[model samples]
Target: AKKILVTCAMPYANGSIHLGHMLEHIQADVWVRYQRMRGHEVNFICADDAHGTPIMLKAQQLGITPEQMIGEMSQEHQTDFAGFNISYDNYHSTHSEENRQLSELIYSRLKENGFIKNRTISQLYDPEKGMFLPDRFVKGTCPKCKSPDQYGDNCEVCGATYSPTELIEPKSVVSGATPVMRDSEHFFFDLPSFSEMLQAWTRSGALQEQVANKMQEWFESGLQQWDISRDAPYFGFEIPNAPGKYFYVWLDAPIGYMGSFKNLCDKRGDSVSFDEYWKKDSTAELYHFIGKDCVYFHSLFWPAMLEGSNFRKPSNLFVHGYVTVNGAKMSKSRGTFIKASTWLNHFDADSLRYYYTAKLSSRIDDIDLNLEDFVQRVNADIVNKVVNLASRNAGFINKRFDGVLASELADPQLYKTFTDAAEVIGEAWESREFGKAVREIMALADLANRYVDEQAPWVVAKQEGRDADLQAICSMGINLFRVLMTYLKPVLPKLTERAEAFLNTELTWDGIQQPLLGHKVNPFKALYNRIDMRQVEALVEASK
Candidate 1:
């Protein structure tokens, strides 16, 4: 089978990845895990987008070089991602020798193809700093919303968008000086030239259907000329031929996927050229998973870059919505903006993985987490409904049982339920509908709950000394849970231990289809327990 190249947006390495970042990371992680379970050869790569102003400022505060700061931050990110079972094939950096070489190579292709041009335009100048200012360095009042303390790039307070040059009476944040207009030559990537190709690609369903529609709407508005080259003293790899000019972070950030791929190739000591996966259309497919905030970059300018460079276009781009906490934007002041580590301290990461997948779809719709809701949902779903059903019954079987497979499940629903759940969840996973897949699995948990109530195993255990009958019921219950876990293994690998202990059986995708009969069930324990509000509150306070 042809390979697939999957890339997540590199989180900016300026700070720790918050819950919002986890939403994006886990989204891709779950999707890649699904593909891998289906036995696809996939290469998943991500890196810290270390080159940017945020890193520079953060480093200044810490008294370190941007390079040193990001190096440390990237390792933290990698460790956190691994803790959550987010397997990355290569965790590279934009500030690497490999990336610099690849960035120049891609730029060379664009320049040779007449996709690059130079023009001098007047922009803000910070006199105290003696430099031309980018969009983020200048701060001013928003012209539309009259909001003060807004970044020059956009008004976060009012959702108003405008260029830094459009901000009224902009002052340099870098130097706290009133800035003057200055002119400097910089290269541009002509996005409009690829407009036709992009529209055609979208109409062909290269992007998710809903996202493609959004792109068509945005395209009708107009494709703005993107500023591709930034002036010196920037955080990224500089343009090779243009002295003191660097490629805009967004431009090379996506290409970091390709750069990381090259690094992987080199590491394997395989001379297998990366061109087949990147430069050729026949050998591989590109599927990009990103949040809605970056829609313009992936749908507009990114496709433009590939078309201009004659590289393989993306087979599809999946965009998911942002995360809000309890129907509000995460407020640090309220201690609602839970950090990834904070969330980890209280609950299993797999629980949140289940929650996000339950809410998210293939479209760009933001999911909200009410702190109260997260605790309620995880216990109700993973604990009471799913885990509790398995634990109470499995212990009865383990008490009398030997470690062996049970006879074939007597209930017809057993086969139907297993087959149906497997097909639906697996298919949803393949479509990148992780949220839907999660909901589908949780639905089985509900069914298991209902099945347990119907069996009344405790009642059966008390009646007629029918210990063997009770054992059979326990076997069916645990087996059903086994089926669910095999499908859910990608999302929560840690649960595999609980599943193994309950069934006294190891599993594969095909093993889930068979019944564990005549086999003794093994010992089982609590998979998860309900969280008390007091503990949850303490976690919130500590995170704050």
Candidate 2:
């Protein structure tokens, strides 16, 4: 078995989990689960990004300490993820001692290597809050397009990048105060020093094609020295040498990946060395699943930091696009920017999981969550095409044949056809082409349903003295159902558990190779209810 470590981007702790956050986590969870089913030794870890000025400001607004705020936020995040069946092996926090130590270690390594420099920079200061503001804390008109209420770093309207100073009549988002220009001594990482290394890594197949092509723009713009320090009152580890200054949130956020693994190793005992997975020359594979918005940090800043720290760089970076509702940006007024908790209150988590997998591909393209399309797709594909196989075949075996299958597969060739699809599906999953995998699995389901339709097993049961033939036919259908469930085990795990109980066997990849012949099967019930439009309406109402 190959050794591998995977991670999803740490969710920010400033707000509740949204559908957009679920997209990346679900994608990573599916891939990690698939790898495990294939018998690989995989460690999946993620954490709550509980630092940054935003968290501090949010805590202040809530009248709680930052620690208390993040603690509550982490619990909510964990609950939401668990509700959706995201199987993270180790879900930790960026505020942990492990992160603090590792962040300082990496920073020290950069310092020793002459990659750190001190710079005095002017930034907008929020006098009302008595703090220097990060880019996110300032808002004003865009310098390039003159779009009002643009953010400090980039204009959302025009997609133009600029400095905070470029914003016309900038105002503090935190206190609505006119910010004053203030100069502070800050530590900068020599990011331009790693330009050659980043260029080679970008072309080294570590990123997707489009992502790599996008990196070319940043490269041409020239890598600037990254300011890795923030002023006081930030919710992060303080820089060792820079008194009252904290390591920027972006600097320590990715280090949380290593810290999470270290914590996991601690939990698993000393026998599992964390170094074996993170050491520079280790054979274990590493991957990060992130959204397109953070591609710059993950692809360039993250790898450069890892190399500087004498750790293994990521083997691959899977980047995806933002989630839109009904082919448009999520609007709070339209009840489209729904939280994960609100979604669970009215709909089954698996519906969203299945829908996302159906739409997800290897490309960095945005996904649209059309509620009408969602209801129809789940009802048609999963409810009608997939789960219908089990519900149709299981009753005949249960009520008629004492829940016992035939002595052997009556249609060995058909069983082979379903089993044969595994390789193609597995490849698609491995390449992060989940939509391809879903299509392949659905085709097999279609063929199985077609065979049952042609055989007319229910009609065969009605004929006198056709019990044996009916048993054989329904048994073949059950075996085919088992094969399809194995293919879908990673995508719909709850359904897989139900399938295992029905088959009286573990649903596994190897189990697919051998048909469950002469086996005692359990009575089958509906694995899932058909998606109802009323639930969708109720969810939208709740969002409103």
Top candidate when judged by TM-score against the true structure: 2
lDDT of 2 by residue, 82-190 (tens): 9999999899999999999999999999999988999898878999888998788899999889999987799999899988888998999988898999999999988
Error of 2 at 526 (Å): 1.5
Candidate 2, poorest ten consecutive residues by summed lDDT: 266-275
Which candidate should be chosen as best, given lDDT against the real structure?
2
Please give the TM-score that candidate 1 achieves against the real structure.
0.92
TM-scores for all candidates? 0.92, 0.94
Where model 1 places Cα greater than 4 Å from the true spot, the runs are 139-171, 403-405
- Rate residue 57 of model 1 by lDDT: 65
For model 2, the superposed segments whose C-alpha errors exceed 4 Å read 135-178
Q: Candidate 1's residue-wise lDDT over 47-73, tens digit each?
A: 888786666666877888887888888
Question: In the order shown, what is each candidate's alpha-carbon RMSD?
Answer: 2.8, 2.5
